[PDB]
Design a protein around this motif. Structure first.
Motif, PDB file in Angstrom:
ATOM      1  N   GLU A   1       0.798  -1.215   0.000  1.00  0.00           N
ATOM      2  CA  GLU A   1       0.000   0.000   0.000  1.00  0.00           C
ATOM      3  C   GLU A   1       0.832   1.266   0.000  1.00  0.00           C
ATOM      4  O   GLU A   1       0.565   2.174  -0.769  1.00  0.00           O
ATOM      5  CB  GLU A   1      -0.809  -0.039   1.265  1.00  0.00           C
ATOM      6  CG  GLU A   1      -1.835   0.973   1.469  1.00  0.00           C
ATOM      7  CD  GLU A   1      -2.345   0.826   2.855  1.00  0.00           C
ATOM      8  OE1 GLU A   1      -1.527   0.910   3.805  1.00  0.00           O
ATOM      9  OE2 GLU A   1      -3.551   0.594   2.989  1.00  0.00           O
ATOM     10  N   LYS A   2       1.846   1.319   0.860  1.00  0.00           N
ATOM     11  CA  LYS A   2       2.797   2.425   0.850  1.00  0.00           C
ATOM     12  C   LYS A   2       4.217   1.981   1.143  1.00  0.00           C
ATOM     13  O   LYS A   2       4.453   0.974   1.789  1.00  0.00           O
ATOM     14  CB  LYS A   2       2.398   3.502   1.872  1.00  0.00           C
ATOM     15  CG  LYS A   2       1.762   2.997   3.153  1.00  0.00           C
ATOM     16  CD  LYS A   2       2.089   3.862   4.389  1.00  0.00           C
ATOM     17  CE  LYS A   2       1.222   3.463   5.586  1.00  0.00           C
ATOM     18  NZ  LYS A   2       1.911   3.398   6.937  1.00  0.00           N
ATOM     19  N   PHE A   3       5.174   2.758   0.687  1.00  0.00           N
ATOM     20  CA  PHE A   3       6.477   2.639   1.235  1.00  0.00           C
ATOM     21  C   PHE A   3       7.127   3.963   1.624  1.00  0.00           C
ATOM     22  O   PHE A   3       6.740   5.053   1.183  1.00  0.00           O
ATOM     23  CB  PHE A   3       7.383   1.842   0.315  1.00  0.00           C
ATOM     24  CG  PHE A   3       7.614   2.448  -1.040  1.00  0.00           C
ATOM     25  CD1 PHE A   3       6.607   2.451  -2.009  1.00  0.00           C
ATOM     26  CD2 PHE A   3       8.855   2.923  -1.369  1.00  0.00           C
ATOM     27  CE1 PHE A   3       6.831   2.949  -3.252  1.00  0.00           C
ATOM     28  CE2 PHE A   3       9.093   3.421  -2.610  1.00  0.00           C
ATOM     29  CZ  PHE A   3       8.059   3.412  -3.578  1.00  0.00           C
ATOM     30  N   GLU A   4       8.126   3.804   2.480  1.00  0.00           N
ATOM     31  CA  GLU A   4       8.879   4.853   3.121  1.00  0.00           C
ATOM     32  C   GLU A   4       9.533   5.778   2.109  1.00  0.00           C
ATOM     33  O   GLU A   4       9.849   5.355   0.986  1.00  0.00           O
ATOM     34  CB  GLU A   4      10.013   4.175   3.900  1.00  0.00           C
ATOM     35  CG  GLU A   4      10.886   3.190   2.952  1.00  0.00           C
ATOM     36  CD  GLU A   4      10.487   1.666   3.028  1.00  0.00           C
ATOM     37  OE1 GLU A   4       9.308   1.332   3.336  1.00  0.00           O
ATOM     38  OE2 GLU A   4      11.374   0.805   2.778  1.00  0.00           O
ATOM     39  N   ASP A   5       9.829   7.006   2.519  1.00  0.00           N
ATOM     40  CA  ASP A   5      10.730   7.827   1.721  1.00  0.00           C
ATOM     41  C   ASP A   5      12.137   7.251   1.848  1.00  0.00           C
ATOM     42  O   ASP A   5      12.750   7.234   2.928  1.00  0.00           O
ATOM     43  CB  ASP A   5      10.683   9.305   2.132  1.00  0.00           C
ATOM     44  CG  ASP A   5       9.288   9.883   1.996  1.00  0.00           C
ATOM     45  OD1 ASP A   5       8.757   9.895   0.861  1.00  0.00           O
ATOM     46  OD2 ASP A   5       8.713  10.232   3.036  1.00  0.00           O
ATOM     47  N   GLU A   6      12.637   6.785   0.713  1.00  0.00           N
ATOM     48  CA  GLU A   6      13.915   6.124   0.637  1.00  0.00           C
ATOM     49  C   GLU A   6      15.035   7.031   1.069  1.00  0.00           C
ATOM     50  O   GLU A   6      15.728   6.737   2.031  1.00  0.00           O
ATOM     51  CB  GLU A   6      14.151   5.593  -0.783  1.00  0.00           C
ATOM     52  CG  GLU A   6      15.461   4.828  -0.968  1.00  0.00           C
ATOM     53  CD  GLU A   6      15.464   3.925  -2.214  1.00  0.00           C
ATOM     54  OE1 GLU A   6      14.697   4.164  -3.187  1.00  0.00           O
ATOM     55  OE2 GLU A   6      16.245   2.957  -2.210  1.00  0.00           O
ATOM     56  N   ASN A   7      15.272   8.090   0.308  1.00  0.00           N
ATOM     57  CA  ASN A   7      16.153   9.152   0.740  1.00  0.00           C
ATOM     58  C   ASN A   7      15.834  10.390  -0.115  1.00  0.00           C
ATOM     59  O   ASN A   7      14.964  10.323  -1.009  1.00  0.00           O
ATOM     60  CB  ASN A   7      17.592   8.717   0.629  1.00  0.00           C
ATOM     61  CG  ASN A   7      18.035   8.567  -0.803  1.00  0.00           C
ATOM     62  OD1 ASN A   7      17.862   9.499  -1.622  1.00  0.00           O
ATOM     63  ND2 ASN A   7      18.653   7.414  -1.124  1.00  0.00           N
ATOM     64  N   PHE A   8      16.483  11.523   0.180  1.00  0.00           N
ATOM     65  CA  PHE A   8      16.257  12.723  -0.616  1.00  0.00           C
ATOM     66  C   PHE A   8      17.555  13.222  -1.158  1.00  0.00           C
ATOM     67  O   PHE A   8      17.792  14.409  -1.235  1.00  0.00           O
ATOM     68  CB  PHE A   8      15.596  13.813   0.215  1.00  0.00           C
ATOM     69  CG  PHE A   8      14.280  13.432   0.790  1.00  0.00           C
ATOM     70  CD1 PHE A   8      13.144  13.452   0.010  1.00  0.00           C
ATOM     71  CD2 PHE A   8      14.167  13.114   2.122  1.00  0.00           C
ATOM     72  CE1 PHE A   8      11.921  13.127   0.540  1.00  0.00           C
ATOM     73  CE2 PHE A   8      12.961  12.795   2.678  1.00  0.00           C
ATOM     74  CZ  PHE A   8      11.815  12.794   1.881  1.00  0.00           C
ATOM     75  N   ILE A   9      18.416  12.307  -1.555  1.00  0.00           N
ATOM     76  CA  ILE A   9      19.711  12.706  -2.078  1.00  0.00           C
ATOM     77  C   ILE A   9      19.512  13.628  -3.259  1.00  0.00           C
ATOM     78  O   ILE A   9      20.212  14.623  -3.356  1.00  0.00           O
ATOM     79  CB  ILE A   9      20.579  11.492  -2.522  1.00  0.00           C
ATOM     80  CG1 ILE A   9      20.906  10.594  -1.315  1.00  0.00           C
ATOM     81  CG2 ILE A   9      21.880  11.995  -3.163  1.00  0.00           C
ATOM     82  CD1 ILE A   9      21.431   9.211  -1.681  1.00  0.00           C
ATOM     83  N   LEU A  10      18.560  13.311  -4.138  1.00  0.00           N
ATOM     84  CA  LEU A  10      18.359  14.047  -5.384  1.00  0.00           C
ATOM     85  C   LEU A  10      17.326  15.151  -5.264  1.00  0.00           C
ATOM     86  O   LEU A  10      16.331  15.013  -4.558  1.00  0.00           O
ATOM     87  CB  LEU A  10      17.945  13.121  -6.516  1.00  0.00           C
ATOM     88  CG  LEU A  10      18.995  12.076  -6.895  1.00  0.00           C
ATOM     89  CD1 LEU A  10      18.336  11.027  -7.859  1.00  0.00           C
ATOM     90  CD2 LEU A  10      20.227  12.768  -7.467  1.00  0.00           C
ATOM     91  N   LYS A  11      17.597  16.250  -5.974  1.00  0.00           N
ATOM     92  CA  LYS A  11      16.794  17.463  -5.912  1.00  0.00           C
ATOM     93  C   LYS A  11      15.998  17.611  -7.201  1.00  0.00           C
ATOM     94  O   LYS A  11      16.348  17.020  -8.230  1.00  0.00           O
ATOM     95  CB  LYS A  11      17.700  18.709  -5.750  1.00  0.00           C
ATOM     96  CG  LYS A  11      18.762  18.659  -4.620  1.00  0.00           C
ATOM     97  CD  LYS A  11      18.119  18.299  -3.276  1.00  0.00           C
ATOM     98  CE  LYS A  11      19.165  18.103  -2.147  1.00  0.00           C
ATOM     99  NZ  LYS A  11      18.541  17.311  -1.014  1.00  0.00           N
ATOM    100  N   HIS A  12      14.956  18.444  -7.155  1.00  0.00           N
ATOM    101  CA  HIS A  12      14.161  18.726  -8.327  1.00  0.00           C
ATOM    102  C   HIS A  12      14.892  19.799  -9.104  1.00  0.00           C
ATOM    103  O   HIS A  12      14.782  20.950  -8.779  1.00  0.00           O
ATOM    104  CB  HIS A  12      12.771  19.194  -7.932  1.00  0.00           C
ATOM    105  CG  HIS A  12      11.967  18.189  -7.155  1.00  0.00           C
ATOM    106  ND1 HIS A  12      12.156  17.962  -5.809  1.00  0.00           N
ATOM    107  CD2 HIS A  12      10.912  17.418  -7.514  1.00  0.00           C
ATOM    108  CE1 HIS A  12      11.251  17.097  -5.376  1.00  0.00           C
ATOM    109  NE2 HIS A  12      10.495  16.737  -6.393  1.00  0.00           N
ATOM    110  N   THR A  13      15.689  19.415 -10.105  1.00  0.00           N
ATOM    111  CA  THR A  13      16.650  20.353 -10.671  1.00  0.00           C
ATOM    112  C   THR A  13      16.198  21.133 -11.915  1.00  0.00           C
ATOM    113  O   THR A  13      16.791  22.127 -12.237  1.00  0.00           O
ATOM    114  CB  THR A  13      17.992  19.641 -11.040  1.00  0.00           C
ATOM    115  OG1 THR A  13      17.686  18.437 -11.752  1.00  0.00           O
ATOM    116  CG2 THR A  13      18.835  19.366  -9.778  1.00  0.00           C
ATOM    117  N   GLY A  14      15.173  20.666 -12.613  1.00  0.00           N
ATOM    118  CA  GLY A  14      14.665  21.352 -13.771  1.00  0.00           C
ATOM    119  C   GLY A  14      13.685  20.427 -14.454  1.00  0.00           C
ATOM    120  O   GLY A  14      13.323  19.415 -13.882  1.00  0.00           O
TER     121      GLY A  14
END
Lengths: 11, 165, 165, 11, 165, 11, 165, 11, 165, 165, 11, 11, 11, 165, 165, 11, 11, 165, 11, 165
Positions: O81-94
């Motif tokens: 049904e859901k999974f965790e936020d893995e990580n936020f290494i990557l940014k919304h770059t364009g």
């Protein structure tokens, strides 16, 4: 002092 | 999209002084930008048109946006009585920075201020959302009607405002 | 902004020695700067004039501001008995640095110190708010009347003080 | 030590 | 502030081996440098003159400063039985670094260690406060009497100590 | 391990 | 299961004094109980048999369990050099309470203490795991061989120990 | 004071 | 210090495949390195000699060290059933990195993994303690006996291992 | 345990008035109790004897212990210049309560106060460690020589002090 | 997923 | 106010 | 000890 | 809510032993209650039918539910691989409590355990979600086929399982 | 790792428009990468085949992946049904960044969004896991069928989808 | 505003 | 499960 | 300590209405009680004599104490512009409770409210410091001039005030 | 709502 | 204060079923109650009149209030799109409890639920603000048109609603 509040302006 | 631009035509006791225009940083703080844009165009049926700058402190900033009580206790956002600090990505880098007034964390309404200097001490406690594009010289002329404690010696008004693009 | 400048006219056992002047970093810690400035002009009806430097330690700092008890236990701010640590943006970078004495967090009063050395171990626990502009030679002369424990061999006094700019 | 306090001077 | 310098004259089963001297970084951790200086002069009635290095581990460090029990369980500071971690500004950068031993946070007393390699796993949990100036060769010689477990094959002694400048 | 303690020397 | 019971036959310079037995609260702290039980029976090949009480403070407690260095710096658990504070469910309610000695959080080894009073100030910082069942009078007689600083004036030993049921 | 440690006995 | 170097001689269903050697970063994680070094010499009585690699995922890593259960549920350390994450100074920078497997915070035992790529999503949840020095081609060869779920098609074995320098 | 009892023999401008005695709660805060006890006997070579109560406020408390500066800025503990807040188990329940003065968290020295009223607003920020046993009538007599600001109209002195039990 | 545990291997 | 400090007496 | 895990059974 | 009820028919080697029923505490942990309810009826395609109890420890508990690997490394919930700890409202109060096994915070799968004693040291770290209703006698019969370290002397099995009401 | 690559064939109303390919950043967020990889190939029985983009906002992003309810209230991951936020290494770059939609911390399902601008205010609150490789032109063609408030003027569809390499 | 949620779409 | 959300209804 | 009592003589458009008296709980919040006492006597040069109740809401409370601006934006304490939340020992238990108004944490000045119901939603965020003794009827009468929004239909005045005991 | 503030009176 | 009381007149596919009335606990959660009261009178221009109950789970609750989208994705509050959790003073104590639905912390809008049992697993994640006063039988009747997944078999409608006292 120099704040920018809305209601209680402080010093 | 580009970032939107709004205009304020400023008046001093009803005599026109000039125009100030703003880039709103909707690419950093879209929610906070939009509130200000919307209140500038008047499109929700209330907003900044006709409102005054109730507190002007030369060397520091011009504070306005209180369209409901014109003394610092008022105004409202297009989102309700108050909304949350969106982020603090942008800093108070210098003159012309446009930033939210508040009464503590998560109390953004309609009041804003236009900086006439680098105001670094406010970084992290006021959401910065725009900057003056043209007409800094008009904000500088508005300053002269302020005082140390903020009281203005003439009535400084947004006679018209809206969006340029 | 233009950062205010205050001056002290320093006497040694009643004999005028000379002038120290200070830039106040109103653009980083305006509330802390304003306190010192106003205590220096006397404009609230109390302040630094006539007060002494009660603790001088060679190689470290000169400490004064205690205009009510003359010994480290006293002073008050223009805002009440104490005020909060405004911020820690500025560090203790070298001689001439002006910083607040305290009795732990959020207990700023009227007491301050003028560094005569880089004092890095105080960064983050004393709000730095200004720096000697001119008269560092006067501070060095002052420094010679201190001792390891801070007791002074002559009464080092602020005969007069005020704002230049 | 080398502190700058107001009242309880420490070492 | 010029940083003080202390000396240890080291002896092996009483046989003079040589002088190690130390810069104390009083410009970073004045309280921690002063403890060690005073212990090294013996000026407070007690100190390092006559004590031994009870734990020496080749490739890591030499530990000493236990002048009440000579085994790691003893020593006291000039501020009392123990004192707080002053700060962790300085890191364990290489051989020669003087840092404090402890039994966890805020348990500094009189015990210290002279590093013989870079010990970065200790950054943050031991206050670095000084560094070997002259005599690193004399430490590399002491190093040879230790062992993987730290027990020393001979009595490594501080036959004399004090302050040069 | 490689610690520098005063009392409970650990691994 | 019931909670296990262990015995210590205490000797004073090799002369038998008596037996102390303990309930170990394996229904609250099974891991901490088991460590002590196992070291009491000797079944991992090391343990308390033959060990001494190195620190006895009349009115406070008897401390032992240091079977590797007999001075407070030693011992080891059946789990390794150290294990974690299991929980702090039980409090130091009064005489006879048996509780872990340590050198800070999560440093349980083999050392323990037997209380001769309510030691409330230790609640939350020493894992309580048992209480004296019979032979408090023997712990009271052991007290008399202690002193304020803990040094014992005769050699107090666990001549035998193990489990009764 | 009255502690029960293993290594650095404190007051 | 001069970091130790261990070797594994790998074997595939009994047949010598080759030798991989590893630098252990005792200069960053001395206790983690020492655990793995000791397990490689067998010098405490137990160790990796004759253990298999139960889980090899191509383009990810080879996992070994479960010398008690040979399936991931086992192994123990020279310090007891488990020890703490020493620190996360080193990152999973590319192929060859040797790091600890675990079952969450502070559960390091003997299980390890040799990276066959950059594994950055594991930075700061697995203690990096060494790198493959020579024999990366052998590790490449071991991969091919792996699968996507980790089951190996042949029994990959540390036939022999010890220290070099 | 049996809680120690100390006594003070109080003089007013050199004239002996009488004896106050106190129970020390060694069974709740042994380190705090021990400090007061030993400062009271004089057994470390310094202490309360000859010292004055520098701040007396009717309806609140009598404050003394400042045996080095006689004014609130001084004193030292038997453990060094300051020690930590042991715990806050005991509350300020009424007159007779003995508690530590401080300058914020973890700055216990030699200074203390004897309450003459329930002082609940100090719970959790002053370590309570004893209570008047006998001589509360002496404390009440003392209390009359204070004032709203704490200045005393006669010199209230601890002519002698010590342990009864 | 891609984890390296010792017991519960997760996705 | 009514505090019991050592050095900076407050209100 | 007495724990009830799923994979790394501990003491 | 009628709280649901499930049943297990337990079989030693192949032989029927008896029936164990449980109340699932759907009114405190509806979600955990439901996972187990569905794994019992087998209604999602997989579940507890024909699984074994792989770890039984007399005087402690019986552990099973690992339907994919039969050794504690497996199982999965009806919600997926793992689910969160729902809450810890309920405590391990005595024999018969049903609670989740896990591998640390938020890794509930399908594995569970039936207590044969108050297991209070598991409070807060294992979600408790049901209690044996009838057949406690059968559970105690199962106990006897287990050992100190958990391994069972005969294959204990849930031959059948479902829901009564 | 070869980073995987997937494709979408997009269809306005029924008409082919074109093909969008993405790199999945399996080397930074392997787990999130895999969910989307499998929902694309359809290989678990369900997935993205024949789902729509239910919310498209010009100058912002296109949102889809809701394969169970087509309106943003649905979707589920291959892990449940859901999974965790893995990580936020990557940014919304364009433009072109692929990132997870969600309903707050740790509720990733199947919903995702393709950015048409740098969306930096989503950094940290949305796991970024891929970037459009080819077909950005098609994405911009999709933009145009959306509105301020997200509703699309024609049914935008993933007619086919799978994995290239 | 400009958020990308799954169910409560916000301003 | 038994939740009362406004958007993503969960198990 | 006997708790002080102040009086307000209330007037409606100047027409005497009656006396309200207040116990101040100086035994719980001495600093907060003293502020109000002194404001009520006017002894520091300023205070409540002549001020109005600017916001009165039937069924909730009457708010006053703004003697510098008469609208909620003003007032000052005897300790300066603002002072800290002393403690929250006391709760809002019912009608008659005297508590402090603020603009968030640690912003107490001179504004207060007299409750006319139990206001428990405020426990923790407003320091309760007193309670109506005599005159509750006079408050219930004032209550009648308010309105749901708080504006008053007449000028409710504190024509006189001071301390009874 | 029912607050008692000094400056920004909220709902 | 005297708590308000609202009524819902329910309707089933158009046919009057009956009236439920509710106490709103404005004495604990005045802002949450006021939102629901206002939405019930329609007095701000919008509200519950004519809205349905989209999600009814027997033995759990009836969820309503989505008067903008009628499916759970909608509704708004008298204070804006969302407001904050006021407090969790009240618990889900049994049938009849009225509480707020949300999509996590601080997302209260207009959606609510009437409990048809004790829902304690929801304490401290949903603000309880009222209880059914009369008409619990009508709510019992509405249940029966529910299902396990919440879809209703007939359209359950608030035909009319307003306030009573």
């Amino acid at each position: 002092x120099l704040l920018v509040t809305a209601g209680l302006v402080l010093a | 999209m580009v970032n939107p631009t709004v205009f304020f035509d400023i008046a001093v006791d009803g005599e026109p002084l000039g125009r100030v225009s703003f880039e709103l940083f909707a690419d950093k703080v879209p929610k906070t930008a939009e509130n200000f844009r919307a209140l500038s165009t008047g499109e929700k049926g209330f907003g900044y048109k006709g409102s005054c700058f109730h507190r002007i402190i030369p060397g520091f900033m011009c504070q306005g946006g209180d369209f409901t009580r014109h003394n610092g206790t008022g105004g409202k956002s297009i989102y309700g009585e108050k909304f949350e600090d969106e982020n603090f990505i942008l800093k108070h880098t210098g003159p012309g920075i446009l930033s939210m007034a508040n009464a503590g964390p998560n109390t953004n309404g309609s009041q804003f201020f236009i900086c006439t200097a680098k105001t670094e001490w406010l970084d992290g406690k006021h959401v910065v959302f725009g900057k003056v594009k043209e007409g800094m010289n008009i904000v500088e002329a508005m300053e002269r009607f302020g005082s140390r404690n903020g009281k203005t010696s003439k009535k400084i008004t947004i006679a018209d405002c809206g969006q340029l693009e």
